[PDB]
Paper text:
CD4+ T cell autoreactivity against citrullinated (cit) self-epitopes presented by HLA-DRB1 is associated with rheumatoid arthritis (RA) pathogenesis. Here, we examined TNC1014,1016cit peptide, which contains citrullination at position P-1 and P2, to study the underlying [name]-HLA-DRB1∗04:01-TNC1014,1016cit molecular interactions. The TRAV35+/TRBV10-2+ PB [name] was previously isolated from peripheral blood mononuclear cells (PBMC) of patient with RA. We show specific binding to double citrullinated TNC1014,1016cit peptide presented by HLA-DRB1∗04:01, and the citrullines play a critical role in determining PB [name] recognition.
To understand whether this secondary structure transition of the CDR3α loop is ligand driven, we also determined the structure of the apo form of PB [name] at 2.75 Å resolution. Superposition of PB [name]-HLA-DRB1∗04:01TNC1014,1016cit holo and PB [name] apo form at the Cα backbone of the [name] showed a very subtle change with a root mean square deviation (r.m.sd) value of 0.57 Å. In the PB [name] apo form, the CDR3α loop was unstructured, whereupon Asn111 and Thr112 were positioned downward. While in the PB [name] holo state, the 109VGNTN113 of the CDR3α loop reoriented with Val109 and Asn113 to point downward facing HLA-DRB1∗04:01TNC1014,1016cit. Thus, the altered conformational transition of the CDR3α loop in the PB [name]-TNC1014,1016cit holo state is ligand driven.
Author numbering:
A (entry chain H): 3 to 29, 37 to 46, 48 to 58, 63 to 72, 74 to 81, 83 to 254
B (entry chain G): 1 to 29, 37 to 59, 63 to 68, 74 to 220
Write the structure that this text describes.
């Protein structure tokens, strides 16, 4: 398989970032793409070991292929124009390419705009329970930047995948503003009898990808680090 | 250099119907590929085409690229929810210098809408589990004919139709969320800028 490291990353303008790619098939060809909302654009591609040639958009990037199984992509001086979802690829015999899971990279002019999400769970309405004999819980995560969030539902320790409906794309809170904070919505629908049981524990988890332990904070608020903000709710019988 | 024109950019087809994406080029391509990138995942090869004019089919999928070696299409039959994602066409760069590389199109983002057989459209108000002061509005149980639009109020947030969980489609329903901090915010007039079913249940807290 192909692995990519890291999966989520936040950096600043002028910083040096390296994205890692690995493969276990010993494929000779390897590729590095960026997927800006222009399609898949080739940055660099390596025919074999120590063979590196430029692609369609090589400006601002540097690669190396000292060994076959690795193809690191380096941003020399990160710019806001290099904010993208980066996909690594490899291929044995052309043309079929195998892609990694992708790296979501966000370059910022400053880390004063990164914020963790505020998560809240909203209990179903008795009107819905009386009308449809169902109970929809709504999870709301607001005020986070960037949109490196993963929402999941937790019910009594197991993972709820039935009756779950999460937003496809986050919602810019101030769409006219640049680098505006985001909001994410989600829903979980259970039977009316399942919600009326008070022992059932509902918890909405939002995995936020923020700052690493190797970053610093000169401001006063808690350093927006990679963390998990969760909201809970228990099923009232009335 | 070589360019692959993929159309249409978006496709919102409903569950069970057919899918059709085209892919045209100004130059010839000896090999045409199709990829499917599911949300949050990477692109995976869908079908490889090595013979011109050969109608290949792996059950639900059907693809072909013409004898002119400049066009290609992809057809998905009986749309199921897991077909949501981006679809790229690719062609191996003709020549040896650019060989190994492949030119991709812009891609078509596909969305599959559920078939709600028994619609019961209603707008409910849900209270927060911590501060009973805050609440959200829940428009739900409307069929795919109803389209939810944003709000003209800058301080009102509107959520479009959500993509359901591909793992399990149990309790498959359409839903939209609205909330705001304005004291003039009431769920009865939250979705006022959208066309809503006339027989929409509007209960009270």
């Amino acid at each position: 398989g192909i692995t990519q490291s890291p999966r989520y990353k936040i950096t600043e303008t002028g910083r040096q970032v390296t994205l890692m790619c690995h493969q276990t098939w010993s494929h000779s060809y390897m590729f590095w793409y960026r997927q800006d909302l222009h399609g898949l654009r080739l940055i660099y591609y390596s025919a074999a070991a120590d063979i590196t040639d430029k692609g369609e958009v090589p400006d601002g990037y540097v690669v190396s292929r000292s060994k076959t199984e690795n193809f690191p992509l380096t941003l020399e001086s990160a710019t806001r124009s290099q904010t993208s979802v980066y996909f690594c690829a490899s291929s044995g015999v052309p043309p079929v390419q195998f892609f990694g899971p992708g790296t979501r990279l966000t370059v910022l002019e400053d880390l004063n705009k990164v914020f963790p999400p505020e998560v809240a769970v909203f209990e179903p309405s008795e009107a819905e329970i009386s009308h449809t004999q169902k109970a929809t819980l709504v999870c709301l995560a607001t005020g986070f930047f960037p949109d490196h969030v993963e929402l999941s539902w937790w019910v009594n320790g197991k993972e709820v995948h039935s009756g779950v409906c999460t937003d496809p794309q986050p919602l810019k809170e101030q769409p006219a503003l640049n680098d505006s904070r985001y909001a994410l919505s989600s829903r979980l629908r259970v039977s009316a009898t399942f919600w009326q049981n008070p022992r059932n524990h509902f918890r909405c988890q939002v995995q936020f990808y923020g700052l690493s332990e190797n970053d610093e904070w000169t401001q006063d608020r808690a350093k927006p680090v990679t963390q998990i903000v969760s909201a809970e709710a228990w099923g009232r019988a009335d | 250099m070589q360019q692959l024109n993929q159309s249409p950019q978006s496709m919102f087809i409903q569950e069970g119907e057919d899918v059709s994406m085209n892919c045209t080029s100004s130059s010839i391509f000896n090999t045409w590929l199709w990829y499917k990138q599911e949300p949050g995942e990477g692109p995976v090869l869908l079908i490889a085409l090595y013979k011109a004019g050969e109608l290949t089919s792996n059950g639900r999928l059907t693809a072909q690229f013409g004898i002119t070696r400049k066009d290609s299409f992809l057809n998905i039959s009986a749309s199921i929810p897991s077909d949501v994602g981006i679809y790229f066409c690719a062609g191996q760069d003709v020549g040896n210098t650019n060989a190994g590389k492949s030119t991709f199109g812009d891609g078509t983002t596909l969305t599959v809408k559920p078939n709600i057989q028994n619609p019961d459209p209603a707008v409910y108000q849900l209270r927060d589990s911590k501060s009973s002061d805050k609440s959200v509005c829940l428009f739900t149980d409307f069929d795919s004919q109803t389209n939810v639009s944003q709000s003209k109020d800058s301080d009102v947030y509107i959520t479009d139709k959500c993509v359901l969980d591909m793992r399990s489609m149990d309790f498959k329903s359409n839903s939209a969320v609205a909330w705001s901090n304005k004291s003039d915010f009431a769920c009865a007039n939250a979705f006022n800028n959208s066309i809503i079913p006339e027989d929409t249940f509007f209960p009270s807290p």
